[PDB]
Amino acid sequence: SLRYLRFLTAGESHGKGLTAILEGIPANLPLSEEEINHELRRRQRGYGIEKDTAEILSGVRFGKTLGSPIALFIRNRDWGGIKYNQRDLRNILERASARETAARVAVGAVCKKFLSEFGIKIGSFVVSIGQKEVEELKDKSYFANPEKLLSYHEKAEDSELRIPFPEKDEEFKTYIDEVKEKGESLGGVFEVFALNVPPGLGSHIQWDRRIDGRIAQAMMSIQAIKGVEIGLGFEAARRFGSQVHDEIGWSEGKGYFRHSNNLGGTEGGITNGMPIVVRVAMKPIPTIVAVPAASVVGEAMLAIVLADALLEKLGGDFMEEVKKRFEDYVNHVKSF
Amino acid sequence: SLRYLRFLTAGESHGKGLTAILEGIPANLPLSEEEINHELRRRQRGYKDTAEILSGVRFGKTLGSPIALFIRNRDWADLSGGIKYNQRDLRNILERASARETAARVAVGAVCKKFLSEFGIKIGSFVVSIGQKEVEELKDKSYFANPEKLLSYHEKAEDSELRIPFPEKDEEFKTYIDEVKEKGESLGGVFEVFALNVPPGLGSHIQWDRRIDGRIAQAMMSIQAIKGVEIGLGFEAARRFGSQVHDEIGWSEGKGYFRHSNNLGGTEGGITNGMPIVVRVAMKPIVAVPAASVVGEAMLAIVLADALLEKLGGDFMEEVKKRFEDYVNHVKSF
Amino acid sequence: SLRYLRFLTAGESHGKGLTAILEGIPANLPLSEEEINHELRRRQRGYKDTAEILSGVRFGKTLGSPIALFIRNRDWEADLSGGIKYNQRDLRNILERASARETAARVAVGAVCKKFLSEFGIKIGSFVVSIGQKEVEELKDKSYFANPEKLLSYHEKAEDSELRIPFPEKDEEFKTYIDEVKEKGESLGGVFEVFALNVPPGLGSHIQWDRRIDGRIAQAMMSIQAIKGVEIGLGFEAARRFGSQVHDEIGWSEGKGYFRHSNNLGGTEGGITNGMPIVVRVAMKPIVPAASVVGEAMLAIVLADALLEKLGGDFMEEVKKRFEDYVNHVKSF
Amino acid sequence: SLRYLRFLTAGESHGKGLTAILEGIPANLPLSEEEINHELRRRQRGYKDTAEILSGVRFGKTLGSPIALFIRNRDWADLSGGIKYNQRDLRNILERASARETAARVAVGAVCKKFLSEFGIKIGSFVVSIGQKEVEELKDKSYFANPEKLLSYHEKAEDSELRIPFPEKDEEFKTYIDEVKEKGESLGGVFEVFALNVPPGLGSHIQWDRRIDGRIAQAMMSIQAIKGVEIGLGFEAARRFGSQVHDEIGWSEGKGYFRHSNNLGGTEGGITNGMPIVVRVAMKPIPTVAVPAASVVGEAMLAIVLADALLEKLGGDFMEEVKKRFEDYVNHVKSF
């Protein structure tokens, strides 16, 4: 459950389409269908007219948000059972199917646009598919390196499997087919990150306000996701406090920061100022690798949580107002 | 957050005490302070604490009104929180962020456990690793589908000083801990929490925030020092073939639907499937993992009590239990 | 807000159309676009509108998933406070969403809740009680608040009235008066009453301020554009009379259980419904028949929410069975 | 209900006492038990209650954490509730339903009032009628647009044993009441609660549940015995012509944009307009004169709603932060 933003999605996999209504994004935010469609396209190319497109039904005029609810519709074009008493599990799968994640990505696309206005960037990349892992990423020191993270995301965009090293593509494509010929499905793991998130988002005062918990629900709620780690995660539970602890640093023109990021950008339920890093595990599908698409949905979920948490801290009804409060707050952080 | 129950905790680590208010538990539920104190003691034992019921209970039974609890303090997030709340006197945040707050959580959880027991639902847990030392016997997770095994591990854990399923290894672990403590070092750990006899159908796939897996993930990860959470096999499942993770569906007269394995941890597509709910939680170093496991039980009880009430609704046990029976028969007879 | 149901509406007055998403209605509830349009039309006559079901319904029945509706604004070919609030220099951006046109989406959502409610024998209706200084005299005495037959009858006649007044015969007196005031540079507001029949006792709760059914109905009604006043039962009049005068004496009978001899309380006691007709009086300031139709929708939403809150359930059969078990429990208490 | 603040109250009429937890009040707000007790006393005189702060306050200031309050119970409807919760002993319902619960609401309301005072927002009320007897001088509601008059009526009311704006009429009302008492009768009443210096922009028109009027209506109508609520003129406005109801808009250099009258009650289109917020509340006869006490609870409820709406608009975790945003916003208002 979000604290500031509100949204609902609807639609069955084989129905007229998917509908979503997002409320809470401030007024005067430049927003276009192309920005939304771009994200929908990344998710589509993650499974391996046909292109998903969203039509804005309200909330936007002359390229800017009005401040009113934003409604989107995604045509399908190709146009549980016990709990709801549905003998035909089709009615259950229709709505359950990962088809619904497309609406999540559309809502997330709006949140990403909102976040970018504050210089906040979200990205991701696959680190393992089946038993084959991206060995270059076993050392997690890059969790504290914005340039590297961004670098890996950029390369993932040039990968048919969204892996940080496209050259490895052919190699991975081999292992995959080598497995799909044995009538076997594959799972995977990806990492999602957010850069330039100021310290102070989320809160330690109540269990449900902790940023980590919120991130956890958003990620684990994605279909097929069975595991989630913030930063080092389970590996951190096997190490010594000293080999996990992120050393605190400070500078005159920068304020406080950390020398490493094993915590994944959060400390005691609140963001660190360091990159937010989340590791997500997707179990093998059914029985067309889906981990790449999953990672794109992961970015959408993280953008929703962060946009929500940022608005919770800043408040505001129009961009000029929110941006001013962000600037004052960041100034307060730097000089603390 | 929750979908049916509502609660809030308050109090600083070194203040007068911890306060908690829980709303939504049906009326006529036998409840006593000992049942609460029992859980509070298990928490401290994992590293004197009692709770006084201030309202919501009369003649040993809930009135259906809000239940207020107070845990008197006998001895009467840092930095980021300091920046966040403009608190120069850092102790102002550390005070509320302290794991002492988890005591109020366990207090609330205790009431939820009692509620759940009325339906035969049992919650338990045990530590599987501390630092680099793991309980090798528990390496194979086949026991995720075995209610008897899970329960026995919990029971034995209650006799372990570190809540490990094999008390005879306490010295082997204690030596390791004392050893790491010899140096200037702290340790984290990993525990598994489970719920038995939970009916399929809890939670929902209709909306991302209603899926039971996300709700379990938030509750668990909201616990102090927790940095990782898995439902069932977890990250391990992500590395296997589809056929090695799949929990084949089985059915028999009377027993109804069930699964031959539980790599999924008791949930499928955002809803409980009838199998034991199993959650793996990773705690980073700050020893404290045993107390964390107890807190994990409380969080799981709260999420499940909430999910059960969301499905059944009702204002008094008699009413809620009748609905449970009809639903269960509906499940089997499906 | 709501305790079980969840919904959101969107759309600008002159945009492409109105959108709404409703979540929480049980599966297997018969639902058609015609049942929705029926209400949408009643709303317009209060001053075409057609709703397309985009999801949640298959083979005429609800799937249990979210129900999305779209009301296409076919001719697609206040202000200051919102302008300041949202930094909207062009106040049209505030007007487009604030417009009473938005109420159509609320009526569409309400229509679904009405159908859900009807599956339980619960009926929702309304009628106009006054417009300007002209009030319906025959209804001065509020004794009919405890008479389901009368309330239902007044609603029926209203359905034949151009201004939804409970006495079609008075249509001309009202229309004439309206034209007179309209002949001048003036506009009128009005009062209407909304009721719900066959609602069981126990809906809502007294344990927490935000769960009391009276506060929930009040927000729903007052949220309607131009509504400045709301009362449950006698309302402000009850505040003027003596205790013994407003008090609804409790009655009981073998084959009917507990009930009340009068309904000055409007079907609510201490935060809970008491079994009597739920009656709400609503005041709309100048610039009412259409508003009364919106009032029905809002009361349907709140009651459907309160019903599901008490019963739970994911499919009609399940809910209806818990209903019967609950009602029997009430009678034999 | 609320969108920013969160709180819960608990306790039975004759139990050990009343408990409450309020979350969301910013850090560094001066707060003492006497500020709370003062409000608790006003309530008692409306028919020594004292609250004990158990957390959320250190050195006279809020820490930013949840605020817990306990109100001792020294002495340490029913049917519908008895049926709903299957309680054969109707004393189990009366104990919680009892207007005794309002004491907890007033304690919560006190903290909110203090918060609101930091911004110059003032909340008050006064009784306008008891039984068939109403304060004639208040028949004309033109004083809704007069901050000074309203405040005056409230101060005068504080000198009345029936919180009526005209203390001289006390004996007059006392007798009338006494006469009604003789023939074994109970009386209801009508009071008006106002809020001064509230800026335009609180609440929203974008979604039904965000509109300020609706939020005020639930808060008020949720008070025991309340059967009616009006914002401004109310039902009387429904009986008037548009021109004799609408508040014409005026503009000036200072405090730009204002209204010439306040028939609307300080809200329009679901948003506060800067004018005084005025609510008229009707309380039925209890059971088969508590209207003065009811007015004090009405104040607490309006304060909670407004503090929540103000926080919703401003956001913020500490007072210095919230105050600058308020200043900036008001600056935006005056120059719009």
Coordinates of N, CA and C in Angstrom, one line a residue, chain A residues 139-281:
Chain A
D139 N 31.4 -9.9 -7.8 CA 32.0 -8.9 -6.9 C 31.0 -7.7 -6.9
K140 N 30.3 -7.5 -5.7 CA 29.3 -6.5 -5.6 C 29.7 -5.1 -5.2
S141 N 31.0 -4.8 -5.4 CA 31.5 -3.4 -5.1 C 30.9 -2.4 -5.9
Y142 N 30.4 -2.8 -7.1 CA 29.8 -1.8 -8.0 C 28.5 -1.2 -7.5
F143 N 28.0 -1.8 -6.4 CA 26.7 -1.3 -5.8 C 26.9 0.1 -5.3
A144 N 28.2 0.5 -5.1 CA 28.5 1.9 -4.7 C 29.0 2.7 -5.8
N145 N 28.8 2.3 -7.1 CA 29.3 3.0 -8.2 C 28.2 3.4 -9.2
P146 N 27.6 4.6 -9.1 CA 26.6 5.1 -10.0 C 27.0 4.9 -11.5
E147 N 28.2 5.3 -11.9 CA 28.6 5.2 -13.2 C 28.6 3.8 -13.7
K148 N 29.1 2.9 -12.9 CA 29.1 1.5 -13.3 C 27.7 0.9 -13.5
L149 N 26.8 1.1 -12.5 CA 25.4 0.7 -12.5 C 24.8 1.2 -13.8
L150 N 24.9 2.5 -14.0 CA 24.3 3.1 -15.2 C 24.9 2.5 -16.5
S151 N 26.2 2.2 -16.4 CA 26.9 1.5 -17.5 C 26.3 0.2 -17.8
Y152 N 26.1 -0.6 -16.8 CA 25.5 -2.0 -16.9 C 24.1 -1.9 -17.5
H153 N 23.3 -0.9 -17.1 CA 22.0 -0.8 -17.6 C 22.0 -0.4 -19.1
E154 N 22.9 0.5 -19.5 CA 23.0 0.9 -20.9 C 23.4 -0.3 -21.7
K155 N 24.3 -1.1 -21.3 CA 24.7 -2.3 -22.1 C 23.6 -3.3 -22.1
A156 N 22.9 -3.5 -21.0 CA 21.8 -4.4 -21.0 C 20.8 -4.0 -22.1
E157 N 20.6 -2.7 -22.3 CA 19.7 -2.3 -23.4 C 20.2 -2.7 -24.8
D158 N 21.4 -3.2 -24.9 CA 21.9 -3.6 -26.1 C 22.0 -5.2 -26.1
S159 N 21.4 -5.8 -25.1 CA 21.4 -7.2 -25.0 C 20.0 -7.8 -25.3
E160 N 20.0 -8.9 -26.0 CA 18.7 -9.6 -26.3 C 18.1 -10.2 -25.0
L161 N 19.0 -10.3 -24.0 CA 18.6 -10.9 -22.7 C 18.8 -9.9 -21.6
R162 N 19.1 -8.6 -21.9 CA 19.3 -7.6 -21.0 C 20.5 -7.9 -20.0
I163 N 21.5 -8.6 -20.5 CA 22.6 -8.9 -19.6 C 23.6 -7.7 -19.8
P164 N 24.4 -7.4 -18.8 CA 25.4 -6.3 -18.9 C 26.5 -6.4 -19.9
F165 N 26.7 -7.6 -20.5 CA 27.7 -7.9 -21.4 C 27.2 -8.5 -22.7
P166 N 26.6 -7.7 -23.6 CA 26.1 -8.3 -24.9 C 26.9 -9.3 -25.6
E167 N 28.2 -9.2 -25.5 CA 29.1 -10.2 -26.2 C 28.7 -11.6 -25.8
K168 N 28.3 -11.7 -24.5 CA 27.9 -12.9 -23.9 C 26.6 -13.5 -24.4
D169 N 25.9 -12.6 -25.1 CA 24.6 -13.0 -25.6 C 24.6 -14.4 -26.3
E170 N 25.3 -14.5 -27.4 CA 25.4 -15.7 -28.2 C 25.7 -16.9 -27.2
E171 N 26.6 -16.7 -26.3 CA 26.9 -17.7 -25.3 C 25.7 -18.1 -24.5
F172 N 25.0 -17.1 -24.0 CA 23.8 -17.4 -23.2 C 22.7 -18.0 -24.1
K173 N 22.5 -17.5 -25.3 CA 21.5 -18.0 -26.2 C 21.7 -19.5 -26.5
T174 N 23.0 -19.9 -26.4 CA 23.3 -21.3 -26.6 C 22.8 -22.2 -25.4
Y175 N 23.2 -21.8 -24.2 CA 22.8 -22.5 -23.0 C 21.3 -22.6 -23.0
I176 N 20.6 -21.5 -23.3 CA 19.2 -21.5 -23.3 C 18.6 -22.6 -24.2
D177 N 18.9 -22.5 -25.5 CA 18.4 -23.4 -26.5 C 18.8 -24.8 -26.0
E178 N 20.0 -25.0 -25.5 CA 20.5 -26.2 -25.0 C 19.6 -26.8 -23.9
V179 N 18.8 -25.9 -23.2 CA 17.9 -26.3 -22.2 C 16.5 -26.5 -22.7
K180 N 16.1 -25.5 -23.6 CA 14.7 -25.6 -24.1 C 14.5 -26.8 -25.0
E181 N 15.5 -27.4 -25.4 CA 15.4 -28.6 -26.3 C 15.1 -29.8 -25.4
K182 N 15.3 -29.7 -24.1 CA 15.0 -30.7 -23.1 C 13.7 -30.5 -22.5
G183 N 12.9 -29.6 -23.1 CA 11.6 -29.3 -22.5 C 11.7 -28.8 -21.1
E184 N 12.6 -27.8 -20.9 CA 12.8 -27.3 -19.6 C 12.7 -25.7 -19.6
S185 N 12.1 -25.2 -18.6 CA 11.9 -23.7 -18.4 C 13.0 -23.2 -17.5
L186 N 13.3 -21.9 -17.7 CA 14.4 -21.3 -16.9 C 13.9 -20.1 -16.0
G187 N 14.6 -19.9 -14.9 CA 14.3 -18.8 -14.0 C 15.4 -17.8 -14.2
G188 N 15.5 -16.8 -13.3 CA 16.6 -15.9 -13.4 C 16.7 -14.9 -12.2
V189 N 17.7 -14.1 -12.2 CA 17.9 -13.1 -11.2 C 18.3 -11.8 -11.8
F190 N 17.8 -10.7 -11.4 CA 18.2 -9.4 -11.9 C 18.3 -8.4 -10.8
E191 N 19.0 -7.3 -11.0 CA 19.2 -6.3 -10.0 C 18.6 -5.0 -10.6
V192 N 17.9 -4.3 -9.7 CA 17.3 -3.0 -10.1 C 17.9 -2.0 -9.2
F193 N 18.2 -0.8 -9.8 CA 18.8 0.3 -9.0 C 18.2 1.6 -9.3
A194 N 18.3 2.5 -8.4 CA 17.9 3.9 -8.5 C 19.0 4.8 -8.1
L195 N 19.4 5.8 -8.9 CA 20.5 6.7 -8.6 C 20.0 8.1 -8.2
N196 N 20.8 8.7 -7.3 CA 20.5 10.1 -6.9 C 19.3 10.2 -6.0
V197 N 19.0 9.2 -5.2 CA 17.9 9.3 -4.3 C 18.4 9.9 -3.0
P198 N 17.8 11.0 -2.6 CA 18.3 11.6 -1.3 C 18.1 10.8 -0.1
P199 N 18.8 11.1 1.0 CA 18.6 10.3 2.3 C 17.3 10.9 2.9
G200 N 16.6 10.0 3.7 CA 15.4 10.5 4.3 C 14.1 10.0 3.8
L201 N 14.1 9.2 2.7 CA 12.8 8.7 2.2 C 12.5 7.4 3.0
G202 N 11.2 7.2 3.3 CA 10.8 6.1 4.0 C 11.0 6.5 5.5
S203 N 10.6 5.7 6.4 CA 10.8 6.1 7.8 C 10.8 4.9 8.8
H204 N 11.5 5.1 9.9 CA 11.7 4.0 10.9 C 10.6 4.1 12.0
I205 N 9.8 5.1 12.0 CA 8.8 5.2 13.1 C 7.7 4.2 13.2
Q206 N 7.4 3.5 12.1 CA 6.3 2.5 12.1 C 6.8 1.4 11.0
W207 N 6.5 0.2 11.3 CA 6.9 -0.9 10.5 C 6.6 -0.8 9.0
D208 N 5.3 -0.3 8.7 CA 4.9 -0.2 7.4 C 5.4 1.0 6.6
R209 N 6.2 1.9 7.3 CA 6.8 3.0 6.6 C 8.2 2.8 6.2
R210 N 8.8 1.7 6.6 CA 10.2 1.4 6.3 C 10.3 1.2 4.8
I211 N 11.2 1.9 4.1 CA 11.4 1.8 2.7 C 11.8 0.4 2.2
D212 N 12.5 -0.3 2.9 CA 12.9 -1.7 2.5 C 11.7 -2.6 2.4
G213 N 10.8 -2.5 3.4 CA 9.6 -3.3 3.4 C 8.8 -3.0 2.2
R214 N 8.6 -1.7 1.9 CA 7.8 -1.2 0.8 C 8.4 -1.7 -0.5
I215 N 9.7 -1.6 -0.7 CA 10.4 -2.1 -1.9 C 10.1 -3.6 -2.0
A216 N 10.3 -4.3 -0.9 CA 10.1 -5.8 -0.9 C 8.7 -6.2 -1.3
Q217 N 7.6 -5.5 -0.9 CA 6.3 -5.8 -1.3 C 6.1 -5.6 -2.8
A218 N 6.6 -4.5 -3.3 CA 6.5 -4.1 -4.7 C 7.2 -5.1 -5.6
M219 N 8.3 -5.6 -5.2 CA 9.1 -6.6 -6.0 C 8.5 -8.0 -5.9
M220 N 8.2 -8.4 -4.7 CA 7.7 -9.8 -4.5 C 6.3 -9.9 -5.1
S221 N 5.6 -8.8 -5.3 CA 4.3 -8.9 -5.8 C 4.3 -9.2 -7.3
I222 N 5.5 -9.1 -8.0 CA 5.6 -9.4 -9.4 C 5.4 -10.9 -9.6
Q223 N 4.7 -11.3 -10.6 CA 4.5 -12.7 -10.9 C 5.8 -13.5 -11.0
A224 N 5.9 -14.7 -10.4 CA 7.0 -15.5 -10.4 C 8.2 -15.1 -9.5
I225 N 8.1 -13.9 -8.9 CA 9.2 -13.5 -8.0 C 9.1 -14.2 -6.7
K226 N 10.2 -14.9 -6.3 CA 10.2 -15.6 -5.0 C 11.2 -15.2 -4.0
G227 N 12.1 -14.2 -4.4 CA 13.1 -13.7 -3.5 C 13.5 -12.3 -3.8
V228 N 13.8 -11.6 -2.7 CA 14.2 -10.2 -2.9 C 15.2 -9.8 -1.8
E229 N 16.3 -9.2 -2.2 CA 17.4 -8.7 -1.3 C 17.6 -7.2 -1.5
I230 N 17.9 -6.5 -0.5 CA 18.3 -5.1 -0.6 C 19.8 -5.1 -0.4
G231 N 20.5 -4.8 -1.4 CA 21.9 -4.7 -1.3 C 22.5 -6.2 -1.3
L232 N 23.5 -6.4 -0.5 CA 24.1 -7.7 -0.4 C 23.1 -8.9 0.0
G233 N 22.2 -8.6 0.8 CA 21.2 -9.6 1.2 C 21.6 -10.8 2.0
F234 N 21.3 -12.0 1.5 CA 21.6 -13.2 2.2 C 23.1 -13.4 2.4
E235 N 23.9 -12.9 1.4 CA 25.4 -12.9 1.5 C 25.8 -12.1 2.7
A236 N 25.1 -11.0 3.0 CA 25.4 -10.2 4.1 C 25.2 -10.9 5.5
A237 N 24.3 -11.8 5.5 CA 24.0 -12.6 6.7 C 25.1 -13.6 7.0
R238 N 26.0 -13.8 6.1 CA 27.1 -14.8 6.2 C 28.4 -14.1 6.5
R239 N 28.4 -12.8 6.4 CA 29.7 -12.1 6.6 C 29.8 -11.4 8.0
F240 N 30.9 -10.9 8.3 CA 31.2 -10.3 9.6 C 30.7 -8.8 9.5
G241 N 30.2 -8.3 10.6 CA 29.8 -6.9 10.7 C 30.7 -6.0 10.0
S242 N 32.0 -6.1 10.2 CA 33.0 -5.2 9.6 C 33.1 -5.4 8.1
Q243 N 32.8 -6.5 7.6 CA 32.9 -6.7 6.1 C 31.6 -6.4 5.4
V244 N 30.6 -5.9 6.2 CA 29.3 -5.5 5.6 C 29.2 -4.0 5.8
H245 N 29.5 -3.5 7.0 CA 29.4 -2.1 7.3 C 29.9 -1.1 6.2
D246 N 29.1 -0.2 5.9 CA 29.4 0.8 4.8 C 30.0 2.0 5.6
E247 N 31.3 2.2 5.5 CA 32.0 3.3 6.1 C 31.5 4.7 5.8
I248 N 31.2 5.5 6.8 CA 30.7 6.8 6.6 C 31.8 7.8 6.3
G249 N 31.5 8.6 5.2 CA 32.4 9.6 4.8 C 31.7 11.0 4.8
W250 N 32.5 12.0 4.6 CA 31.9 13.4 4.6 C 32.8 14.3 3.9
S251 N 32.2 15.3 3.2 CA 32.9 16.3 2.5 C 32.2 17.7 2.6
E252 N 33.0 18.8 2.6 CA 32.4 20.1 2.7 C 31.3 20.3 1.6
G253 N 31.6 20.1 0.4 CA 30.6 20.3 -0.7 C 29.9 19.0 -1.1
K254 N 29.4 18.3 -0.1 CA 28.7 17.0 -0.4 C 28.0 16.4 0.8
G255 N 28.4 16.8 2.0 CA 27.8 16.3 3.1 C 28.2 14.8 3.4
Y256 N 27.4 14.0 4.0 CA 27.7 12.7 4.3 C 27.4 11.7 3.2
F257 N 28.2 10.6 3.2 CA 28.0 9.6 2.1 C 28.7 8.3 2.7
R258 N 28.7 7.2 1.9 CA 29.3 6.0 2.3 C 30.4 5.5 1.3
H259 N 31.4 4.8 1.8 CA 32.5 4.3 1.0 C 32.2 3.0 0.3
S260 N 31.1 2.3 0.6 CA 30.7 1.1 0.0 C 29.2 1.1 0.1
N261 N 28.5 0.1 -0.6 CA 27.1 0.1 -0.5 C 26.5 -1.3 -0.4
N262 N 26.9 -2.0 0.6 CA 26.4 -3.4 0.8 C 25.0 -3.4 1.4
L263 N 24.6 -2.2 1.9 CA 23.2 -2.1 2.4 C 22.2 -1.8 1.3
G264 N 22.7 -1.5 0.1 CA 21.8 -1.3 -1.0 C 21.0 0.1 -0.9
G265 N 21.7 1.1 -0.3 CA 21.0 2.4 -0.2 C 20.0 2.7 0.9
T266 N 19.8 1.7 1.8 CA 18.9 1.9 2.9 C 19.5 1.5 4.2
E267 N 19.2 2.3 5.3 CA 19.7 2.0 6.6 C 18.5 2.3 7.6
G268 N 18.2 1.2 8.3 CA 17.1 1.4 9.3 C 15.8 1.8 8.8
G269 N 15.4 1.4 7.6 CA 14.1 1.8 7.1 C 14.1 3.1 6.3
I270 N 15.2 3.8 6.2 CA 15.3 5.0 5.5 C 16.4 5.0 4.4
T271 N 16.2 5.7 3.3 CA 17.2 5.7 2.3 C 18.5 6.4 2.7
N272 N 19.6 6.0 2.1 CA 21.0 6.4 2.4 C 21.6 7.6 1.7
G273 N 21.1 7.7 0.4 CA 21.7 8.8 -0.4 C 22.6 8.0 -1.3
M274 N 22.9 6.8 -1.0 CA 23.7 5.9 -1.8 C 22.7 5.3 -2.8
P275 N 23.2 4.6 -3.8 CA 22.3 4.0 -4.8 C 21.4 2.9 -4.2
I276 N 20.1 2.9 -4.6 CA 19.2 1.9 -4.0 C 19.5 0.7 -4.9
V277 N 19.8 -0.4 -4.3 CA 20.0 -1.6 -5.1 C 19.2 -2.8 -4.6
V278 N 18.4 -3.4 -5.4 CA 17.6 -4.5 -5.1 C 17.8 -5.7 -6.0
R279 N 18.0 -6.9 -5.4 CA 18.2 -8.1 -6.1 C 16.9 -8.9 -6.1
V280 N 16.5 -9.4 -7.3 CA 15.2 -10.1 -7.4 C 15.3 -11.4 -8.1
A281 N 14.7 -12.4 -7.5 CA 14.8 -13.8 -8.0 C 13.4 -14.2 -8.6

